Symmetry: C2
Subunit: 664 residues, 2 copies
């Protein structure tokens, strides 16, 4: 009764929602619907309206003034130019004099023109009128989000160790690479729980193998790491290498588990291993088979994974490569200047993640052949679902770490989100901040971004500022990609500043975990925009560079180079808190209003709300060793905090003993 569902045509069943909603037969309640040239929803907005939503999408909290396309893609350009990121999160809320939420349950290319063409006009459009549109009513945006969170089902919950800090690098290959990382952190007493394994740990980039020469007794090495409280977290890619004798490949061909061309041959896309096939993630039998393959690593002591390249990414197809070679041949023998080098450059760019390639293969959905482009935004979702369901079959009571690159609403139940590569961009700290609440609205709470680097561009201060935001993001890792400067926390001058920043994370782990758990278990938000907490404050609702976390605190990271502080707006009285590099905590009461606050590179700030408190533990070097017995309470005298704690390993969420009232 606060949710209606309007059905057009014959929508594909995405499983985004867990709750059944009856089909509405009355007029569509807002704006205008046109089925004239495909499908379009058009709404004229009031001047003061704010538009929230779109989860993993470009620009700010208020989405007005740009165009967003839901179309899972890895576009090799600066973020500022992107129409589309990796996620398709089709939920928006119009908030103003008239407030309502909309979820467009549609698996293919969906365009949100949000005041881009005409400032007062919101237009949502797609090529086929085959979708469900859910309309959600409420008295405010926050109320609407909670109703949405209920129907899409409980968010993924990670094991507690995943609330520690993790290091990786595209390039760690040998046992010695990993041993050096373990020594570097542990001997310098920098806290760490995880080391990520990028694609080089495989045999020739083959999913569900390990390099035999580099890791002859892999389970013993996993144990060697685990004995020092270091959990190895390996990558799994969408593409399965074409190679005779490789079991995964052989099984997939024999059992028709790969995506097929129109003639029924297995589609070939080049990725890391050269030629690959994609498992048919929309086929239930194929899903169960692919997910079951994770047993290979679980049986060796691995407790978490990440899924990558799962748009699916395509460097080129056999068809695209042939066209490119053909065109290059014309270029080569052109003497009359008919083919310009820039037409040559465009052709080469064009074969990567090509729209034409996405219509060259099909999914077998319960016996019905569906062209991939029609359901493109479901692929990464279904890959992560395959793994999640397999974990449930393997060990239904154990939590595994799991996160994905590509996603769609529904996937939030199975794993978290890798938000993107910040490379060495100062601009991206603020972009990460803005995206966090929007992701929470769509069910994705376990999220964080990479600072992959770019040449030597990651300076000491960029990393420290990035990590000080990372303190608060459930996924906190330092993982080099294109960066060539050594970027582990022990590789820079004045190592103590890095230790101070990571210490703050570990001191806050009990609180951050508690807040995550309470929010996940009650279908609520971890990060919130200020406007959700202070809806009557016209200043608060426009703030895009601070966030509320749980019900106790506000964050406001420094995101400018060479800055020694920043401006903040406090909507109520708050205690300005800083974790200091000597292990102390500075505290200052600041009244409602505008402030400039000082924040050094080695300082981690936050603000505790009036009438609230948080528990703070002493710094420990791993999650297991955190002393939660008698934590310091920080904030206002006389306040209480409800601490959630469990074993962090299993799914015994409903024990009364999980909850403890603390009082300052």
């Amino acid at each position: 009764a606060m949710i209606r569902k309007y059905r057009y045509g014959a929508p594909f069943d995405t499983e985004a929602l867990t709750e059944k909603i009856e089909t509405a037969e009355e007029a569509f309640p807002y704006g205008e619907i046109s089925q004239k040239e495909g499908f379009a929803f058009t709404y004229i907005m009031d001047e003061d309206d704010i538009v929230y939503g779109l989860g993993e999408s470009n620009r700010g909290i208020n989405k007005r003034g740009y165009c967003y396309i839901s179309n899972c893609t890895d576009d090799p350009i600066h973020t500022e130019d992107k129409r589309s990121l990796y996620g398709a999160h089709n939920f928006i809320i119009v908030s103003g004099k008239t407030t309502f939420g909309l979820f467009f349950d549609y698996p293919s290319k969906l365009t949100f023109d949000i005041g881009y063409t005409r400032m007062d006009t919101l237009k949502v459009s797609c090529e086929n009128a085959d979708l469900d549109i859910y309309v959600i009513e409420g008295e405010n945006a926050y109320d609407i989000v909670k109703q949405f969170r209920r129907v899409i089902g409980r968010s993924y919950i990670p094991p507690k160790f995943a609330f520690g800090f993790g290091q990786s690098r595209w390039g760690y290959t040998t046992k010695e690479d990993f041993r050096a990382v373990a020594k570097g952190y542990r001997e310098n007493h920098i806290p760490i729980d995880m080391i990520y394994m990028d694609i080089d740990y495989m045999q020739d980039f083959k999913d569900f193998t390990v390099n035999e020469k580099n890791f002859p007794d892999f389970p013993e090495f996993v144990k060697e790491m685990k004995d020092q409280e270091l959990r190895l977290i390996p990558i799994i890619d969408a593409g399965v290498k074409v190679e005779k004798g490789y079991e995964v490949y052989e099984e997939g061909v024999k059992n028709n588990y790969f995506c097929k061309r129109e003639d029924g041959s297995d589609f070939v896309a080049a990725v890391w291993p050269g030629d690959t096939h994609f498992p048919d993630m929309l086929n239930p039998e194929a899903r169960k088979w692919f997910g079951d393959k994770y047993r290979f690593l679980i049986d060796q002591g691995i407790e978490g994974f990440w899924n990558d390249m799962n748009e699916p990414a395509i460097f080129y197809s056999s068809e695209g490569l042939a066209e490119a070679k053909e065109f290059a041949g014309e270029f080569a023998k052109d003497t009359e200047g008919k083919i310009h080098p820039w037409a040559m450059q465009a052709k080469m760019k064009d074969i990567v993640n090509s729209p034409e390639d996405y219509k060259r293969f099909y999914h077998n959905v319960n016996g019905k052949k569906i062209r991939h482009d029609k359901v493109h935004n479901l692929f990464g979702y279904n890959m992560t679902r395959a793994a999640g369901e397999a974990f449930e079959r393997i060990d239904p009571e154990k939590r595994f770490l799991m996160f994905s690159r590509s996603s769609y609403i529904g996937m939030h139940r199975y794993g978290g989100i890798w938000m993107g590569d910040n490379k060495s961009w100062w601009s991206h700290i603020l972009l990460n901040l803005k995206m966090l609440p929007s992701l929470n609205m769509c069910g994705f709470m376990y999220t964080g971004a990479d600072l992959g680097g770019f040449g030597d561009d990651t300076t000491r201060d960029l990393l420290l500022r990035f990590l000080a935001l990372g303190v608060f993001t459930p996924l906190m890792r330092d993982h080099a990609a294109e960066g060539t400067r050594e970027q582990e926390c022990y590789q820079f001058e004045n190592i103590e500043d890095f230790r101070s920043v990571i210490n703050a994370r570990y001191r806050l782990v009990p609180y951050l975990y508690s807040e995550y758990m309470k929010a996940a278990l009650n279908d609520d938000m971890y990060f919130k925009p200020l406007g959700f907490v202070y809806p009557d404050d016209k200043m608060a609702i426009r703030v895009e560079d601070q966030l509320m976390l749980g019900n106790e605190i506000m964050i406001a990271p420094v995101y400018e180079q060479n800055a020694r502080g920043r401006y903040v707006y406090l909507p109520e009285e708050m205690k300005f808190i800083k974790f200091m590099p000597d292990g102390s905590i500075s505290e200052e009461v600041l009244e409602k209003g505008v402030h400039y606050v000082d924040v050094a590179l080695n300082e981690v700030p936050l603000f505790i709300r009036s009438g609230k408190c948080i528990p703070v533990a002493e710094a420990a070097e791993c999650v297991k060793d955190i002393d939660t017995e008698n934590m310091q309470l920080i904030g206002y005298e006389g306040s209480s905090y409800t601490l959630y704690e469990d074993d962090g390993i299993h799914k015994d969420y409903d024990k009364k003993e999980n909850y403890r009232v603390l009082t300052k």
Copy 2:
């Protein structure tokens, strides 16, 4: 006295300074000089030191924390990744407990590592120890700037009409195109003084021609425009088209005025016309010849120009094109998969502005051949000098509008700077703002940036905010480049908002021109960092998103999308002023300290300093029609302002009649 020159090896004479300084004999006074690896200057900075300078370079006012390379280049990437912009402005100031200025008079690739490799270390290096280093002493940074501005000679002074507003588009090609612009502005009462003519006005991209089909009676059409106070401002490119019977080409060939390969053949570079030659800008006779060609346009009633592609840009050379086609044939025939599409992409990119190509041609300086890479950063500078010197021979009494893409210190005497293309990037509003004072320190005051757009990405609010900073920048124009959305002011909803912003510029023209003229004639800055004006205020010295203009005002543009205001810091009491859309001016006194100020999309903000006032004219539609007789004075009751005003056309600067004291 306060400036010493240190000479290394045999430096090329760049003619950057007009003042002759003697070669010092003593040890270099700061840091360490090394010649082991070419040339290197190394300085250990105090933690609190700030580094100013580098004119047109990336990032902020404080240059610490990054690497900057002086190497004039058009790099086709997002600005955030750029090591090098279009200018080479080799002046830095170290400001702190120890303060000093350095000018590196070196015409080739010069690397500024300002705390990038190691946080406390400033390293300046180049391949060849053949340069002059000027050390400038002084009590503070501003004092050092003024010293430097004295010895480099007086900045270029534009005609007054160039302080109006200008519209252009890559694509205006017919009389009808220009007439529609004129009608679109004039019928809607939007002020304007200039229409730019991009490359389509030429006959087949040939310099010093006009398209014969589109402009058969060009003098008449120039007058048609001028009778409406619209001055046409055509572009000139560095590359002269290779074409039989084209007189500029034929004369360049016959008289050896083009840059040559080492064998003496005329070097070929492809740009807009296809194959071109580059005029040998460092040969004095070739300079005279090239500059004299501007007479063709001046004789038709043209009063200003812009020089472009003058790095010089090279799409490809004949040598690069052949290597590319050879590699393409290899790729085409590759059956064993040894040549990947990304190696082919890399090859196509590599032939554009190739460092190899810059080593392939030579300048002839009075018989002496010099390889272009050795003097690369002087090309645009000398092109603009050629035009500047020709104007003096053609009509010595008259000012001409002149600005350039590429530059080096010394060029500031001859023309202004086009700061770059913001495309449709919100991030570039702040980038523009930060660059302004640094350009001013190096002598370049007539400056502004473009919002050339990108597909349809320039939205209404972006253009409004861009124009509202543009109000204060001496070069103010709306010029579409890559943008495909119509972006003239009359092409959006609610034209009145665009009229309001542009009205604010025309009301401020007498003040802005006055301050420019005072600054230029006294070798002073037009824009200043807050720290230059409030050097004992610790907060003021770190402010980077606000500028002082002259001695009366402070500017603080809104640079965030969907923002309804912004934070500011006031180092003294000021009057916060806004030009309102109804033609009124609102005033509010704000005390020293931190404030949040409301600024709507259609409002132009500024602040008047305690004890100061400025004159504001009533809105007029062209510079000619501005009534400067009875302007209201805005600001503080006891105060006065010295107005500089001349005829805006000639070069009679000295006279007492140019000054009048206005008293509030």
